């Protein structure tokens, strides 16, 4: 059996194209195969996407894999919803309930909000880019009203290439006048690397500053330069290199050839290319399951042109989208389980922090168990509680009248109690008052 | 569909309305196929050739009237249908002028 | 100095050689720390500028 699908790739998607071919070879089975039929296009142009869709509809495809942008998300979901052709994508999740579209990227807005109440911020800044939609900005602005925040939102995306350095430096000086110590960065990997370089040059990576990089790829960008500075950096990642299934893949990924597979000989993989590798597994698992329940999707009749008046559906496409949503496998991202609409549910996002040793892990995020810390830290033994012994004699140490209600140091009062408070302030320690058990000042038998 | 059917008819210019969902379809087709489009809808953010906007802008008029009434704290209620370009103007001006 | 964050305001540096502008100087320029130095070659002079 040979199942024929379609592919839509942007210009310059070199690492995602390589991980697509690697997923073809490993997830190949002797029972059936997949035919790619790969095309290349400009993703921002709605004219080029329209020609690419109606071309592959004429040849006749069972499913289409591709990327989209904000400028062409409406062209995809309208064609796929009308002409009943399924669409699997690693791009940003759409807003609403669009049929026939499978989102392979997990949502981020719930994880980003929960991290902010953990650090307990009341006032911060938010730098955004308009490329992935404004769904993350609308989430934090609506949530700021009910939970009493003060958010400064600045658009950084439309900066021209020739005048970058004047505009970024004028931006942080305006933040300096407001004394904004807390910055959230919502940008792609290339735009974050440009902002981080402008942070260091004007001297904004010193102790006292905090940064949150709001994307699924934390360690994909350059991170060594802000590491030794002194400012805390937090972030998110969905790919766990400590997992055995991922670590087995990285060993095969590093040993590949550069001249055949460009971008292969590295130690890391992007989160975009990881979801491209997982999507080949989901498509293969569906047609393997579809043949197993003996469902025929053969279409001997010609499709015709896409611009058909009236537009007619084909009822085998309803069967295919139900098969794609009923796929549960294990991948690089983790457990892949879908709801009715096609958005990923039952997933985990790893909250990370930057240290001088390197990036670490401090917990995870799930939609059932909101934020769970990982108890790998033992601290507090460095601080000492000094044991202060005393005797009960008036007016030196006396018991207060409500000693039953109070506990510990609050129970006692007197001259020596005030003296103990003064010495601990000048010396710099903490104490716990204990009455001597014998009740005597001191002698030697 | 309606753009290409009239393009087969051989029309000189096209008069129509667009929404936020179909703003990207119109400006891309008319830019490539070099046909003029005259519209009373909201102006596009940025510059696009072969599109004639009949509606004037409003972002300068709001920032004058707010400054004239001398406001420092207010609430902004918006609908998403004409884009978010008006909200981006009053958020960038708020940081500069302490609102 | 820059990587560990020691070019901020409050610091001063004197580079004790006859060539001050021969080295790279743009990176500590916008930081905030004062830098002093020495030079014997005057580019404003007409004999040097020729
Ligand atoms: C997701 O569901 C599967 C069973 O369908 C379960 O084994 C797994 O533990 C779930 N994920 C999490 C994070 O609990």
Curated annotation (Swiss-Prot), chain C:
Palmitoylated. Depalmitoylated upon L-glutamate stimulation. Ubiquitinated by RNF167, leading to its degradation. Induction: Down-regulated in the pyramidal cell layer of CA1 in the hippocampus by global ischemia. Detected in forebrain. Detected in dendrites of neuronal cells. Expressed in the pyramidal cell layers of CA1 and CA3 and in the granule cell layer of the dentate gyrus. Glycans are attached at residue 34. It is found in: Cell membrane; Postsynaptic cell membrane; Postsynaptic density membrane. It comes from the Eukaryota. Ionotropic glutamate receptor that functions as a ligand-gated cation channel, gated by L-glutamate and glutamatergic agonists such as alpha-amino-3-hydroxy-5-methyl-4-isoxazolepropionic acid (AMPA), quisqualic acid, and kainic acid. L-glutamate acts as an excitatory neurotransmitter at many synapses in the central nervous system and plays an important role in fast excitatory synaptic transmission. Homotetramer or heterotetramer of pore-forming glutamate receptor subunits. Tetramers may be formed by the dimerization of dimers. May interact with MPP4. Forms a ternary complex with GRIP1 and CSPG4. Interacts with ATAD1 in an ATP-dependent manner. ATAD1-catalyzed ATP hydrolysis disrupts binding to ATAD1 and to GRIP1 and leads to AMPAR complex disassembly. Interacts with GRIP2. Interacts with GRIP1. Interacts with NSF via its C-terminus. Interacts with CACNG2, PICK1 and GRIP2. Interacts with GRIA1 and SYNDIG1. Part of a complex containing GRIA2, NSF and NAPA and/or NAPB. The postsynaptic actions of L-glutamate are mediated by a variety of receptors that are named according to their selective agonists. This receptor binds AMPA (quisqualate) > L-glutamate > kainate. Belongs to the glutamate-gated ion channel (TC 1.A.10.1) family. GRIA2 subfamily. The M4 transmembrane segment mediates tetramerization and is required for cell surface expression. This is Glutamate receptor 2. The gene is Gria2.
């Amino acid at each position: 059996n040979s199942i024929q699908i379609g592919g839509l790739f942007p210009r310059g998607a070199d690492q995602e194209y390589s991980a697509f071919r690697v997923g073809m070879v490993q997830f190949s089975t002797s029972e059936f195969r997949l035919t790619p039929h790969i095309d290349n296009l400009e993703v921002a142009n709605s004219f080029a996407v329209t020609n690419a869709f109606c071309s592959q509809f004429s040849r006749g495809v069972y499913a289409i894999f591709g990327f989209y942008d904000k400028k062409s998300v409406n062209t995809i979901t309208s064609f796929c919803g009308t002409l009943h052709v399924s669409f699997i994508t690693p791009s940003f999740p759409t807003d609403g309930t669009h049929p026939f579209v499978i989102q392979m990227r997990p949502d981020l807005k719930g994880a980003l909000l929960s991290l902010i109440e953990y650090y307990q911020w009341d006032k911060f800044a938010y730098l955004y880019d308009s490329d992935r939609g404004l769904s993350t900005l609308q989430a934090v602005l609506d949530s700021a009203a009910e939970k009493k925040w003060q958010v400064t939102a600045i658009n950084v995306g439309n900066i021209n290439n020739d005048k970058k350095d004047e505009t970024y430096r004028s931006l942080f000086q305006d933040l300096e006048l407001k004394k904004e110590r807390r910055v959230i960065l919502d940008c792609e990997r290339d735009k974050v690397n440009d902002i981080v370089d402008q942070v260091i040059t004007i001297g904004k990576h010193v102790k006292g500053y905090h940064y949150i990089i709001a994307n699924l790829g934390f360690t994909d960008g350059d991170l060594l330069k802000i590491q030794f500075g002194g400012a805390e950096v937090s972030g998110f990642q969905i790919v766990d290199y400590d997992d055995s299934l991922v670590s087995k893949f990285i060993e095969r990924w590093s040993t590949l050839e550069e001249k055949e597979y460009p971008g292969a000989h590295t130690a890391t993989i992007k989160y975009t290319s990881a979801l491209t590798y997982d999507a080949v597994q989901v498509m293969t698992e569906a047609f393997r399951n579809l043949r197993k329940q003996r469902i025929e999707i053969s279409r001997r009749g010609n499709a015709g042109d896409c611009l058909a008046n009236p537009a007619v559906p084909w009822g085998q496409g309803v069967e295919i989208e139900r098969a794609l949503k009923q796929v549960q496998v294990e991948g690089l991202s983790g457990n892949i389980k879908f709801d009715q609409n096609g958005k990923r549910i039952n997933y985990t996002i790893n909250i990370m922090e930057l240290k001088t040793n390197g990036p670490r892990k401090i917990g995870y995020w799930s939609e059932v168990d909101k934020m769970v810390l990982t108890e790998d830290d033992t601290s507090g033994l460095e601080q000492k509680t000094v044991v202060v012994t005393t005797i009960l004699e008036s007016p030196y140490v006396m018991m207060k009248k409500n000693h039953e209600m109070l506990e510990g140091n609050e129970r006692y009062e007197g001259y020596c109690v005030d003296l103990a408070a003064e010495i601990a302030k000048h010396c710099g320690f903490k104490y716990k008052l204990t009455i001597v058990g014998d009740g005597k000042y001191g002698a030697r038998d």
